[PDB]
Structure formats: structure tokens, C-alpha cells
Amino acid sequence: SATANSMNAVKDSLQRGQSTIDVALAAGDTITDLLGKMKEKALAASDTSLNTASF
Amino acid sequence: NALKSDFDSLRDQITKAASNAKFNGVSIANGSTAKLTFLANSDGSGFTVTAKTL
């Protein structure tokens, strides 16, 4: 019975880990969108016909 | 002399029309650069247009 009771603390720790990784995943999705936009910025900047202001 | 003055004025019109041809401050006709390389792909490989002076 003591073991079956300690399983509660086990479950609490697992839910805490789930919430942690969920926050990390939301941050990762935002980072991926930013990374795609910077790839587009560097691509457009690599053009040589650009005047200095747009660059 | 009149024909000479006409021919010289036409030459001046050529150089003016040739210098004035620009877009965003870059130009191909004026001969102020060797080539212009516009983008062609995500990798950054670029279409290259050889410039032609006028």
C-alpha cells in the first residue's frame, strides 16, 4: 500500500515534465517561423542589383 | 556647318538618353557595371544578365 501511494508523486513529476516540454515546444515553433523569415531576408539581400538603401 | 551643328546636337541627345536610363539607381545600358545577377532559386543560385553598354 505504501508503494501504491508513492505512485502519486511519480505521476505528479511526470505531469510537470509534460508541461515543461510543452512550453519549450511553443517557443520552438516561434523560433522556426523566425528562422524561415530570416532565411528569406538573407536570400533577398544576397541579390546584387539592390541599391544600398534597400540592402 | 548647319549639318555639322545638327549632327553634334544629335550626338549630345544620344549621350543624354543613354545616361538617363536607370531603375533604382542601377542600369545596364550605361555601362557602369559589368553584369547584373538577379536571384533564380532558394539556394541563391542567380540568373546572370551580361550588361550591354549603349
From TrEMBL, chain A:
Top-rank taxon: Bacteria
Subcellular location as annotated: Secreted; Bacterial flagellum
Similarity remark: Belongs to the bacterial flagellin family.
Function: Flagellin is the subunit protein which polymerizes to form the filaments of bacterial flagella.
Quaternary structure, from the entry: In C.crescentus, the flagellar filament is composed of multiple flagellins of 29 kDa; 27 kDa and 25 kDa.
Protein name per Swiss-Prot or TrEMBL: Flagellin
